[PDB]
Amino acid sequence: AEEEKRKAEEEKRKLVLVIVCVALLLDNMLYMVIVPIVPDYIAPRYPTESEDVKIGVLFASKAILQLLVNPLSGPFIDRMSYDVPLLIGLGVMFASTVLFAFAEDYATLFAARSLQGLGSAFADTSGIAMIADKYPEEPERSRALGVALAFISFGSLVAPPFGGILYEFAGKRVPFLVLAAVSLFDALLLLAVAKPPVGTPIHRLMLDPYIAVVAGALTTCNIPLAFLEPTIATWMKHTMAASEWEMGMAWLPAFVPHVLGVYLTVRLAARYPHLQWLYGALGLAVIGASSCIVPACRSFAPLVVSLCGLCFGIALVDTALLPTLAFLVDVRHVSVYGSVYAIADISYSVAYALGPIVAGHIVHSLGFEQLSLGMGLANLLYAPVLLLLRNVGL
Numbered sequence: 250a251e252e253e254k255r256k257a258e259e260e261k262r263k264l265v266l267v268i269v270c271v272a273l274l275l276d277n278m279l280y281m282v283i284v285p286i287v288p289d290y291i292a293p294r295y296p297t298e299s300e301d302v303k304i305g306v307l308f309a310s311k312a313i314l315q316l317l318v319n320p321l322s323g324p325f326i327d328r329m330s331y332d333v334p335l336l337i338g339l340g341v342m343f344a345s346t347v348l349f350a351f352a353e354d355y356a357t358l359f360a361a362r363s364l365q366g367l368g369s370a371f372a373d374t375s376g377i378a379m380i381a382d383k384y385p386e387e388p389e390r391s392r393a394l395g396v397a398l399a400f401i402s403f404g405s406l407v408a409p410p411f412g413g414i415l416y417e418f419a420g421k422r423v424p425f426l427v428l429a430a431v432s433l434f435d436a437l438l439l440l441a442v443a444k445p446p447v448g449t450p451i452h453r454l455m456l457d458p459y460i461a462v463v464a465g466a467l468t469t470c471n472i473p474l475a476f477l478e479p480t481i482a483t484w485m486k487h488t489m490a491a492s493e494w495e496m497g498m499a500w501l502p503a504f505v506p507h508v509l510g511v512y513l514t515v516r517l518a519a520r521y522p523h524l525q526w527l528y529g530a531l532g533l534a535v536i537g538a539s540s541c542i543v544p545a546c547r548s549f550a551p552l553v554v555s556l557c558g559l560c561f562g563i564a565l566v567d568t569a570l571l572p573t574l575a576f577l578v579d580v581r582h583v584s585v586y587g588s589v590y591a592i593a594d595i596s597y598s599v600a601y602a603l604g605p606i607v608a609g610h611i612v613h614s615l616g617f618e619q620l621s622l623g624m625g626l627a628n629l630l631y632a633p634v635l636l637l638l639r640n641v642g643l
């Protein structure tokens with residue numbers, strides 16, 4: 250009897266995990282392959298440039314619009330379900346992707362990136378929130394958030410070089426239309442599978458110092474990849490004259506230590522459940538080590554190992570603090586997971602919204618090693634700030 254319904258429920262819950270993680274994979278593929286495509290119109294590819302604030306405000310339009318939406322879309326995920334705002338996010342992401350494949354101007358690209366911001370808020374917060382919801386127990390919550398962040402890192406690291414070599418071979422019409430078709434197939438498959446209490450407000454999560462220090466951790470761990478992603482792809486030619494094939498391929502061996510860091514902290518959170526603050530702090534420590542060591546890496550292979558240490562550190566901090574964030578709102582607040590991952594994406598959003606607007610300007614004014622040592626100083630001075638979470642078992 251009951252074994253059949255239980256294995257069917259675990260089957261459908263694993264299917265929802267796979268469909269949500271593939272949704273996050275394809276969505277981050279969108280956000281990180283439109284970046285080498287945008288400067289080619291407005292007048293072996295590598296994503297970013299460092300010039301033209303008018304284009305940089307387009308690159309940060311996604312992050313500033315999710316920064317403006319998900320404080321209002323946090324309680325939207327709390328009031329309604331998770332599957333309906335995930336469908337709203339994937340629907341506006343389909344509309345965004347066919348708006349990329351539809352036109353080529355500045356205003357339409359700005360509108361498509363803004364719709365990617367709206368879909369980032371809705372779809373990304375709903376996806377991470379229902380991965381936290383459908384895995385209430387802690388060693389499966391950490392492992393499912395690990396698979397989530399592993400496919401997020403897949404779509405954000407190994408997807409931009411192949412998206413670039415599809416833009417150089419096929420173009421922009423056919424790849425974005427078929428990727429929007431695969432995204433609508435994923436959304437309709439989650440409609441076929443999923444079939445879609447009072448909640449705490451978003452103000453009261455900021456008054457919780459534990460949620461506030463995890464939000465500061467996510468801001469300060471995202472801020473090195475925030476300021477270094479529009480910047481390294483012009484520091485290459487200034488430093489060591491990196492080839493264009495070895496240009497956007499620099500984040501491509503940074504996925505393997507990301508998934509090794511994810512696996513390492515899933516192991517060290519299933520073995521040590523109430524010691525995730527130490528792996529968040531150690532993640533921030535190796536973040537500050539990598540950001541301190543990047544301008545010392547004047548050859549290509551040490552730059553690759555420094556950026557893979559950077560993705561290793563963001564993997565440790567994200568996979569050791571996003572289960573801590575849901576566990577923390579579970580044991581200290583009501584057990585609704587939308588607002589607290591809206592706070593997580595607020596941290597993500599303020600990082601990637603201050604990145605492409607003023608990052609290139611403060612590199613052109615101060616320098617590159619000054620910015621890198623500033624962020625490494627921030628992370629070496631913020632890794633002993635995660636010590637406040639030592640009483641999460643108490």
Ligand SMILES: CCS(=O)(=O)c1cccnc1-c1nc2cc(C(F)(F)F)cnc2n1C
Nearest residue numbers: 277401402405406507560563564567593597
């Ligand atoms: C090194 C981390 S990464 O995955 O490889 C990555 C690489 C390049 C650009 N961005 C990301 C990236 N980091 C995220 C963290 C979160 C969350 F806060 F939820 F943990 C959500 N989305 C993320 N994305 C898309």
